[PDB]
Amino acid sequence: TTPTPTQVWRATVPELPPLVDEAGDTGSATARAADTAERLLLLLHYSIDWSWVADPKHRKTWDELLPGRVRRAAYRADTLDRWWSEVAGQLGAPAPRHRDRRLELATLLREPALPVITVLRDSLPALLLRVRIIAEAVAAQRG
Amino acid sequence: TTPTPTQVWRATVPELPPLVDEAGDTGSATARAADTAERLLLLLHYSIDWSWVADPKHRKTWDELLPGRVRRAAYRADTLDRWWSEVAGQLGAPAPRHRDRRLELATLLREPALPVITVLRDSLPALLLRVRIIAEAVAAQRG
Amino acid sequence: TTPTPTQVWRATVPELPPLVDEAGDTGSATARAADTAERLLLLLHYSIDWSWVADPKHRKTWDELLPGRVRRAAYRADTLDRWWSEVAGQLGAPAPRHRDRRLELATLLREPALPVITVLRDSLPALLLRVRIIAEAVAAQRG
Amino acid sequence: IRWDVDIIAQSSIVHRDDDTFTLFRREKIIGPDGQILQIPLISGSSFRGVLRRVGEALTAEVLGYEDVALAKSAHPLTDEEERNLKELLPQIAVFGGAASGRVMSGLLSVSKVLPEIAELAHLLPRPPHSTPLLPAVLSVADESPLGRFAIETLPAGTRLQTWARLDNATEHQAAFFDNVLSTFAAHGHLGGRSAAGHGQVTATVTATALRGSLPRPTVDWVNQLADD
Amino acid sequence: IRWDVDIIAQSSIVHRDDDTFTLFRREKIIGPDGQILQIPLISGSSFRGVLRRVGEALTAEVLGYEDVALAKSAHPLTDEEERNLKELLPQIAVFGGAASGRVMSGLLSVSKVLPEIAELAHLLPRPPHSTPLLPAVLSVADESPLGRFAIETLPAGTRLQTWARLDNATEHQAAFFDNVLSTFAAHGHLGGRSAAGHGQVTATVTATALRGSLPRPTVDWVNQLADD
Amino acid sequence: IRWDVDIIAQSSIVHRDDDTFTLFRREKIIGPDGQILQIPLISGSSFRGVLRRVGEALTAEVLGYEDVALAKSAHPLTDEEERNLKELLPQIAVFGGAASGRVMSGLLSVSKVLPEIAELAHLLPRPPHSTPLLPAVLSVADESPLGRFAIETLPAGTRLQTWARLDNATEHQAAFFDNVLSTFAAHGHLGGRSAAGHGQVTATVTATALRGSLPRPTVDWVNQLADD
RNA sequence: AUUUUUUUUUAUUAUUUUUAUUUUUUAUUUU
């Protein structure tokens, strides 16, 4: 029914098939945690201005300081404290005037919430490759 | 259609005919895993600066420390954790500004993913001979 | 055209005429496997320092430990795993800075690859006599 | 009556040939398709000897062993040559022997084992693989100079196919041999280092293709006169 | 009598094969379902050797060791070949040896260990996992140039299944071997770096499946004549 | 004699693995209940090395150090192989070493540390908590470009459980090792940044479970011949 | 208008001993 605004993000790059399964989360438990982590970190790059230090690439806010800040915030428990530490760290913005993004985010901030921190630790840059690709493609369709 | 930037690597050394088959992966299952492993490890030597310790050969970053670090990262499961362990180990760089390499890499990071670790274990230096030859030849055509 | 650096090895001992045929591999199938095995094992004695245990003869690295290690590595399949087992066993070195040797070697590591293991099993020391004679003669012309 | 046995190994099967030196696996040749090849196989006499030891061990569980007078030899003492004991004693009647120079006649005939890929055994259970694959473990290096030893063996997963045969479908001897094969299927072994776990196999007996032995017959309780 | 033992590790189990270079784990092959695979396993002779050291250590706690004349060898002096001492001395009777060229016969037969996922051991305790998982710790880097070493080992949680066997249910030797397995279940170890905590395991002994040993028998107090 | 030690940290314990980049904590794997997990633990050889440094420091307080000729290596000079000094010198007899190619035998065997929640150590003092909690301090940022560093460490409140063992309850070496553990319980440390307060712990020694060492024995005053 | 019969290559042996990821680095300053 809903477009579920984290779905229309991933819909812009069909050359990358999905991670979880064909049509529903079956047969794997860490894939659900990885998908939740990717969706959560994807709803963190389009939630801010790019208001940080300015050069013509904005210093890769993307591997220059985003993995460091996400990793540093990933050393707290469980998930609400993590997002507070991140949003006070990096830039600071809840969500723009799109209530679908806000409701999806606040739905997401709680889960099993133990393996998500493990996913943010034991595989960071694959999720960053994913988020970089989706962000670049959905930017490319608005050029 | 696409140049598939791991194909234009292998195209520089026609004196080494391909491993898999004449025109398509038929009749062998371990050859697909070996080709995937060779392509994955080939997209790891041109993904970094050669930013490591500096002498006029860069200490063979090639059998001085690359097989050791690849082997050490090859003792985790399944493939995303492996690449995290490697990229945090050796140098650290996702991919340069060539989105074809990035998309091909992130397509590659998941597969059957069980026999690839076996291929990285039970035959390491043949793949290193391959990667050394292709790297040396494609460097030689830009001299 | 090419000197084919496994040919200039065998060229130093004309008192031993070749094994295969007069001018081309015709009329025998096991002779091709025997020649491939001899060339492969010849590109294994000049690929290392003689870095092993040191006495004024280097303990015949030649029948003291080379046939044992080659035989022990000859109990795996097919050829890449064999060379990994050997190079991790004996000393460990891919090839020196001579790209002709490296390209010839990596061309050689795959073949029919079934009868080569049979040749390494059912006739070891004749190949060792051959390799010892060529190594001794090409050492004697640089004395 | 013939017995077809399929034997799957559960460990390495070392079977010896006839300073830190190796020592090989017994190999017999075949001319399958015009060329000569060497293939490993346990000799058929080794299976017969293992069954002989099993039968002599089993015949002493019901007969007393406190008195005596195996692999028999030939020597003459007085040439006493009446041999009714074949009916009385069901062990030397089946497997033969030599008592006083006149050797006996054995009803049992047993064939060799054929593990590898050939055309000589009965019907195969699997699509084939390559021939020269009998890779070798490395031995124990005494370590009182630790002298490194090394043996050559079949891998733990090789199947083997064998048949044994008693021709004369006459009497209780078929049931006796059925009991012997039951023991060998239960906890049998064949090889050369059974004290180190080499040679543990599991077998199955099948295909009694002629007139079968009647159920519940006497094995050896025939009042045990216990003669020489 | 056979003894079935289940062994759960409590640390890494390094078992060596036969400049800053690695050194692998011993691997033996299986043909399980038509294809060749390499799996790690401690050789069955290593378990026998560990039990041999344990038995020789235990037999010296009740017999004096002030005089002598283990892994025996063969050499001839005068070929004295009377061997009643198997009844007198319960150590070389069970585990065998070589005294004066004529090697002994050992009643003990022990099988290999099988930790990984296969079809060769007895009944499994858990649903399986993948085969190639034997990840490796990294060693200690001497640091007098700190040369980085690295070894390969099984993880600390792997279960192992093994069986040992004495065939001849005769005499006190079953109780002696029961005492040896009690010691090995109490504070046993197997591996290659036991001085660094590698190889600590806990085992359980089960399934004496034949005629059991009578309670409270004599282990070795048979008046200790203490011959050669 | 074995010694059971419980070690409670008083600060962070950094233990390194083997541009403004981080550098992790050493992690070894376990297969506890069918799945593979990574857990942090100091390698058991590090504890042995710390005790080796403590023992060599303690043996020089009563023996003169003005003359010499630790982590020993192997090299041959003339192969002098009489080793009575194990009785004379109570340091290399316990902890082993290499003098002239022939390495020594160490009586000491020590196990790894296990801080986290598992099933491998001895009895637990507290109801458990979660596994992945080893949060990391951030380092000092040199500030001559202030390059921000960061290390990964255990928190200051983690308990650790370890056991060491000398098997041969023979002589004064038990008292010597008791003195070494007394020193380590008094002012011991283990970690990687002890110059910055990382690695301060307090321990307790318990459970001498076999034949105890007699009170007031000689540690090293055996007239100090001070040989090589 | 058989050179046929009977005839385990087998008992025994640890890849064991030794081995610190160590030493060095104010989140400084500016309202």
Author numbering:
A (entry chain h), B (entry chain i), C (entry chain j): 2 to 51, 54 to 64, 66 to 147
D (entry chain e), E (entry chain d), F (entry chain c): 18 to 35, 42 to 92, 107 to 181, 205 to 288
Publication passage describing the model:
The complex best resembles the type III-A CRISPR Csm effector complex, consisting of a Cas7-like (Csf2) filament intertwined with a small subunit (Cas11) filament, but the complex lacks subunits for RNA processing and target DNA cleavage. These findings provide a high-resolution glimpse into the assembly and function of enigmatic type IV CRISPR systems, expanding our understanding of class I CRISPR-Cas system architecture, and suggesting a function for type IV-B RNPs that may be distinct from other class 1 CRISPR-associated systems.
The type IV-B complex resembles a sea cucumber, with six Csf2 (Cas7-like) subunits forming a helical “backbone,” and five Cas11 subunits comprising a helical “belly”. The palm makes extensive contacts with the bound RNA (buried surface area of ∼1200 Å2 per Csf2 subunit), while the thumbs of neighboring Csf2 subunits protrude into the center of the palm, inducing a kink in the RNA backbone and a “flipped” base at six nucleotide intervals (typical of other class 1 complexes (Jackson et al., 2014; Taylor et al., 2015)). (F) Cas11 binds at the interface with buried surface area of 505 Å2 (150 Å2 and 355 Å2 with Csf2.3 and Csf2.4, respectively). Although the M. sp. JS623 type IV-B operon contains both Csf3 (Cas5) and the putative large subunit Csf1, we did not observe corresponding densities within the high-resolution cryo-EM structure.
